[PDB]
Amino acid sequence: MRIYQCHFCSSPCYPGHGIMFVRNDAKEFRFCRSKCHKAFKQRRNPRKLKWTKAFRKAAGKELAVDSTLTFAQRRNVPVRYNRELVATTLKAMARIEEIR
Amino acid sequence: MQLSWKDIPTVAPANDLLDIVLNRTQRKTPTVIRPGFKITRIRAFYMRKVKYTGEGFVEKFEDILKGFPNINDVHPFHRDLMDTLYEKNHYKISLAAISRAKSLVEQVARDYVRLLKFGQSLFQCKQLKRAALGRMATIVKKLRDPLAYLEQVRQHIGRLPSIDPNTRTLLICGYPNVGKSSFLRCITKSDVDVQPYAFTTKSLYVGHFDYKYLRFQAIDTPGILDRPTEEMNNIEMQSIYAIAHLRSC
Amino acid sequence: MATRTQFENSNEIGVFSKLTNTYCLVAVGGSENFYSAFEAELGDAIPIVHTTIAGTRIIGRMTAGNRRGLLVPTQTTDQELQHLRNSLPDSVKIQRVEERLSALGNVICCNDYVALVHPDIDRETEELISDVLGVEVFRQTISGNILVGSYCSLSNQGGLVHPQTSVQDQEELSSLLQVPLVAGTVNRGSSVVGAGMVVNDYLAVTGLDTTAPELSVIESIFRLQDAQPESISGNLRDTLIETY
Amino acid sequence: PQNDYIERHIKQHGKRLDHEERKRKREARESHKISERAQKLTGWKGKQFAKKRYAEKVSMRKKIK
Amino acid sequence: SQSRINNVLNKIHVAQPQARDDVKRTPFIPESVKNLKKYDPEDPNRRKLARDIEAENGGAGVFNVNLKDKYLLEDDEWKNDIMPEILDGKNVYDFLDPE
Amino acid sequence: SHRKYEAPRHGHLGFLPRKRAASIRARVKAFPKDDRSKPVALTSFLGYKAGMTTIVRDLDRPGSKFHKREVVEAVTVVDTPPVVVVGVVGYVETPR
Amino acid sequence: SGNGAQGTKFRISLGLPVGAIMNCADNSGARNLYIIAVKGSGSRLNRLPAASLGDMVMATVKKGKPELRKKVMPAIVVRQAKSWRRRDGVFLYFEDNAGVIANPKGEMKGSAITGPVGKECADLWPRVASNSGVVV
Amino acid sequence: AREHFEKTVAVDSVFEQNEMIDAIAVTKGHGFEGVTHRWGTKKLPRKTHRGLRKVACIGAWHPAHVMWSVARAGQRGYHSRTSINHKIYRVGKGDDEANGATSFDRTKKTITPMGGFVHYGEIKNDFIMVKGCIPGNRKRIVTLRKSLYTNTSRKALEEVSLKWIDTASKFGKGRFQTPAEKHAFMGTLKKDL
Amino acid sequence: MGRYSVKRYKTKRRTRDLDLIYNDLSTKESVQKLLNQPLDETKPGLGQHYCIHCAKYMETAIALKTHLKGKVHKRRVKELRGVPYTQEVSDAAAGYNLNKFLNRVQEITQSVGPEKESNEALLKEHLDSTL
Amino acid sequence: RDGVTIEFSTNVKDEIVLSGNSVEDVSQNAADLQQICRVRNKDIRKFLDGIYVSHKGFITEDL
Ligand SMILES: [Mg+2]
Ligand SMILES: [Zn+2]
Ligand SMILES: [Zn+2]
């Protein structure tokens, strides 16, 4: 599981929901539901449409620049699995979400 | 294609070859009509047998005439070597008889088909069908002797070895009873009888071995006697043409 | 040390396998005859790891690396990727890398020292590889075949290309990689060599239908048996002339 | 393959262990089966049977004469 | 022929490096490979070759490999532990780190 | 006439007469056999269907291509309170 | 399956039926391929043979080099654009319809493949996976 | 059973996980149904006189009766069906909170989808999670024998490990597993404050 | 759902995906190659007369003077002004990989943006050089 | 079968020994064992292998 974010919904996409589209340029366009997937085909603008999060982050609504939003790095070193680090992080993400 | 044509299907002696096709017609085609039916179906009934019988002789013969590798313009090594086994005279004439035999059947078929559309009764058309198959049967009964010939070439030809003319071959000659047999089993994984009397081997034997990562093939011979080259034996004759045709040490 | 193996009937060994000086990777399908083949050769001396990439068996072409590091495409799941870092010892750097282009084993061919790339790879990857693998990077085609990994095999001893490679290609390209180069074939003459076989500094594994002439050629350039320093191409003159 | 391989294989290994009686007992069962089949085999195979059967009666009388 | 010998000489005469630098380059082979004994197939006393484990349970299309139990850890206790991979959405792997 | 193009029959013949069922509760046709050596076992059980949700899981099926690999599929849920016993009926094997 | 296909062909949704033009996706020199026969197909009265991703088909060329035309030849579908399911849960579909052409063993006639290649096709054919630049 | 009079029986005392069972119930009445959807017959093409959604030829002169195998119009649905080899995934105990979590998931949650089920409330008792699709519709009663014999291929051997359970709403496109995320990801609203 | 949105936006009948065209507006090589474009059989203006923003071939250069003085082409120039909304933009709004998001905002501000402005200055001259 | 004894022949290679009081409970139990190793779908002239009745005898020996 990877649980994704919708390319247009900007919402999380659980597996078994939604459709990936693959361009000839071959990068992945997943969708939360067919509402936004049809909105991709009709080629609207989520920076212009209100009810997605890409608007609300860009419009000066719901805050964006914050240190609690800096921890969602997609990492590229898989390092080593100490089991004790896991015990920290499960308490950490519980702590983090309250602060946000 | 080339090299030891194992896959020439089969053939039967003539009475069975007759019996195969006729029983194939009695089973595959329908078999029940009445006098009281419409005339058009009656002709359509007997036409359908005479046609369907006619292909069965042809398609078997076409399996034969496609089958045998057609001795001339094969390769001059193989072309000569089969005549030493099979009489290139007796060979060709047999198969040429079959194409003569095939073409008569299509000729007989097309006539009795063409005659049949003017039939007026059940009784007349029925007598044409029996006459049609009988003249087919007279052809196949005539064909008895060359068919029994082509049995025995077919069982023999698949059991021939395949040599290649162009590859790196080498010849093993010497007198009979010399020591050439046990030598060959020593140089290669090959199944040669080693008995110390003269004309033990009567046909060529092929073994394979490798040297410097290269496929070599050894060829045994039966053996030659002094025998001043006019009168010789076909068992000896195989020995000669291997030396004659092949590029070899 | 040329060794014939099949994957379940397949001679395309380099598709289903990745091999360096220090580790080996196999797919997980079917049965462990294939894994046992590397067990027989390598002993326990290097880690040999069952894995998948994107849940797919084709791991010799999705991945690329050397004894220093190893690269994986974007589609690597976290389960797969954690499984590698658990598996390999800490001399090995592992990194998911993002592009348009996906199959690293076709885009990149490499050794411990100099890597060849597809010419249209993006620049930040070209930045990244020299940091990861610590090697030399060159944008270069093999004879116009734009894929360098399928159409070439590499080592530190030597390298092997597809048989449509001009001498004019080989002469330039060898100066880039500083190893001798051979126009060759594999697996009854399949022109794709990188899918055909794997090789390192001390083992070469190919398909069953790689011929015994072809085995000797592979044994020559990659110098498996001690020692075949290409001078025994001076012995195989009588073979290859008669072969071709 | 490559020549008459069976007859070589016979001349080293030979025909089976139980080849004689299997050959023998089928000849023993033979006079039952022909009498069996002639009272079996309806529907024109018997008509094909009897004409074959009549032919061996003719042929033996020709040989004896 | 001589319309052939040129196309073969591509595969005969190899290319050469011309040696182009001060940079020294060595083929690396660990001595653990070099000190490894050869595999006798008809050995009484040899390595077990996980063909045989797959058969001795066993069989081809029936045997379950433990993918674990062969990889390096600080202790051999937590070989069998399960990665969580999801705490309440915002999954794990984006968050874990050193420090 | 001989149909000119054979094609298999539409619909199974086994499920006839395709009619409305006699209750809302299907009668159990066949119970499993009775080994008279085993401990006492309750052979069946009943519940309430309320379901169709979705599960991802890993598949340990050695031989299939999804071995050691994640696969989603759908499940059903059946609501299952405890069941309370009230009665016992014996049966006599007749020749009837 | 028959020849070439390594592993068990896996169930996906049938996109292209017979008489469906799809693109030519290698560097062979054709433009479009015209599907006329799908090997390994079923047989059902009035049901069309149809193909999908990674299925060996028999097809011809409309546009391209005339030497390549006039003759049926084998091909393997590499992009489907009718949405099939991944058993790790998602549906997905490409932009178009294309396949590349090879011998009945599966060795490619084309040297390199442009466009991305489907994952599920890629496991089945290694010579595809050889000449692949983008899987998925 | 003398002692089990007036006593009740837990469910996990009859089965466990990784067992093939088999489900029988009654199936989803659709009333009086057209032949074509009742049996799967090819349609007559279009504007065919006296209808097009039926079977055209139905007999000959002989026999001069409609035969019993000719797929007429009538009832579809609400038939008693027997469906075998369904596999138990989860026997979770409804008194135990956080049934929906696994060892993998550890997010404390019920099996109950958000909003409850559709035309059904919430799981408050113990439950059986079985893959596949039980014949019958929701709010109906089902029955579960056990496999009648050793029906055991290697499919019926494998011991599954549920990695994650969905519990989003099915009343529309569900998008959150708990109400915490929906309260999280939206941020605070108007009628909050 | 209705007839129009189907028969305009099927998967077969697809336009050309603003990011690729924004990548075509990035550097000078893409400018030159999309102005050279040697002769094709099939392409409507036999290869020639290809606008970039509106990914479209014209039959004749007369159509270009109409096209650039059209509300359609100005609807596309106003489209390609801002940061072109990649997947990176879509996920940073969910609070995911802001660090890659900050860089590309800086890069379109510093490098690509005024280069894309300068490239469009060239397209105004070089197309008015013919028309 | 009941009341027939089976032993593996010591000191003479590759032979098996069946013995009992009944005729038929031996011979059928003998014959079933050589019908079970029948060679299927091969040419029987090249392949010889199987279990064969070698010898019929008495348990006395001498009389
Ligand atoms: Mg002799
Ligand atoms: Zn939407
Ligand atoms: Zn424009």
From Swiss-Prot, chain A:
Biological process (GO), any one: ribosomal large subunit biogenesis
GO cellular component, one term: nucleolus
Localisation: Cytoplasm; Nucleus
Gene Ontology molecular-function annotations: ATPase activator activity; ATPase binding; structural constituent of ribosome
UniProt keyword Nucleus, yes or no: yes
The entry's keywords: Cytoplasm, Nucleus, Phosphoprotein, Ribosome biogenesis
Family: Belongs to the eukaryotic ribosomal protein eL24 family.
Description of how the protein assembles with itself and partners: Associated with nucleolar and cytoplasmic pre-60S particles. At the end of biogenesis it dissociates from cytoplasmic pre-60S particles and is likely to be exchanged for its ribosomal homolog, RPL24. Interacts (via C-terminus) with AFG2 (hexameric form); the interaction is direct, recruits AFG2 to pre-60S ribosomal particles and promotes AFG2 ATPase activity and RLP24 release from pre-60S ribosomal particles. Interacts with NOG1; the interaction is direct.
Main function: Involved in the biogenesis of the 60S ribosomal subunit. Ensures the docking of NOG1 to pre-60S ribosomal particles. Activates and recruits ATPase AFG2 to cytoplasmic pre-60S ribosomal particles.
Name of the protein in its database record: Ribosome biogenesis protein RLP24
Curated annotation (Swiss-Prot), chain B:
Oligomeric and partner information: Associated with nucleolar and cytoplasmic pre-60S particles. Directly interacts with RLP24.
Presence of the UniProt keyword Amino-acid biosynthesis in the record: no
Coverage span on the entire protein: 1 to 249 of 647
Annotated compartments: Nucleus, Nucleolus
Any further remark recorded for this protein: Present with 28000 molecules/cell in log phase SD medium.
Gene that produces this protein: NOG1
Entry's Gene Ontology molecular function annotations: GTP binding; GTPase activity; RNA binding
Name of the protein: Nucleolar GTP-binding protein 1
GO CC, alphabetical: cytoplasm; nucleolus; preribosome, large subunit precursor
Sites where the protein binds GTP: G174, Y175, P176, N177, V178, G179, K180, S181, D220, T221, P222, G223, I224
Coiled-coil stretches: none
One GO term (biological process): ribosomal large subunit biogenesis
Family in the record: Belongs to the TRAFAC class OBG-HflX-like GTPase superfamily. OBG GTPase family. NOG subfamily.
Keywords, in A-Z order: GTP-binding, Nucleotide-binding, Nucleus, Phosphoprotein, Ribosome biogenesis
Role according to the record: Involved in the biogenesis of the 60S ribosomal subunit.
Swiss-Prot record, chain C:
Post-translational events: Phosphorylation at Ser-174 and Ser-175 promotes nuclear export.
An annotated Gene Ontology molecular function: translation initiation factor activity
Pfam families: eIF-6
Signal peptide: none
Keywords assigned by UniProt, alphabetized: Cytoplasm, Initiation factor, Nucleus, Phosphoprotein, Protein biosynthesis, Ribosome biogenesis
Modified residues (Phosphoserine): S174, S175, S231
One GO CC term, this protein: cytosol
SMART domains registered for this protein in UniProt: eIF6 (SM00654)
Protein family: Belongs to the eIF-6 family.
Function description: Binds to the 60S ribosomal subunit and prevents its association with the 40S ribosomal subunit to form the 80S initiation complex in the cytoplasm. Is also involved in ribosome biogenesis. Associates with pre-60S subunits in the nucleus and is involved in its nuclear export. Cytoplasmic release of TIF6 from 60S subunits and nuclear relocalization is promoted by the GTPase RIA1/EFL1 and by SDO1. Also required for pre-rRNA processing.
HAMAP family in UniProt: eIF_6 (MF_00032)
Subunit structure: Monomer. Associates with the 60S ribosomal subunit.
Extra remark: Present with 18600 molecules/cell in log phase SD medium.
Designated name of the protein: Eukaryotic translation initiation factor 6
Swiss-Prot record, chain I:
TM region(s), chain numbering: none
Localization annotation: Nucleus; Cytoplasm
Biological process annotations from GO: ribosomal large subunit export from nucleus
Region (Nuclear export signal-like (NES-like)), start-end ranges: 17-31
Keyword entries, A-Z: Cytoplasm, Metal-binding, Nucleus, Ribosome biogenesis, Zinc, Zinc-finger
Primary localisation category: nucleus
Keyword Zinc: yes
Keyword Zinc: yes
Domain of life: Eukaryota
Zn-finger segments (C2H2-type): 49-73
GO function terms (MF aspect): nucleic acid binding; ribosomal large subunit binding; zinc ion binding
GO cellular component: cytoplasm; nucleus; preribosome, large subunit precursor
Span(s) of short sequence motif Nuclear localization signal: 7-16
Subunit description: Associates with pre-60S ribosomal particles; released from the pre-60S particle very early in the cytoplasm.
Note: Present with 5630 molecules/cell in log phase SD medium.
Similarity remark: Belongs to the ZNF593/BUD20 C2H2-type zinc-finger protein family.
Protein function: Involved in pre-60S ribosomal particles maturation by promoting the nuclear export of the 60S ribosome. Involved in positioning the proximal bud pole signal.
Name of protein: Bud site selection protein 20
UniProt organism field: Saccharomyces cerevisiae (strain ATCC 204508 / S288c)
Gene: BUD20
Entire protein: shown range: 1 to 131 of 166
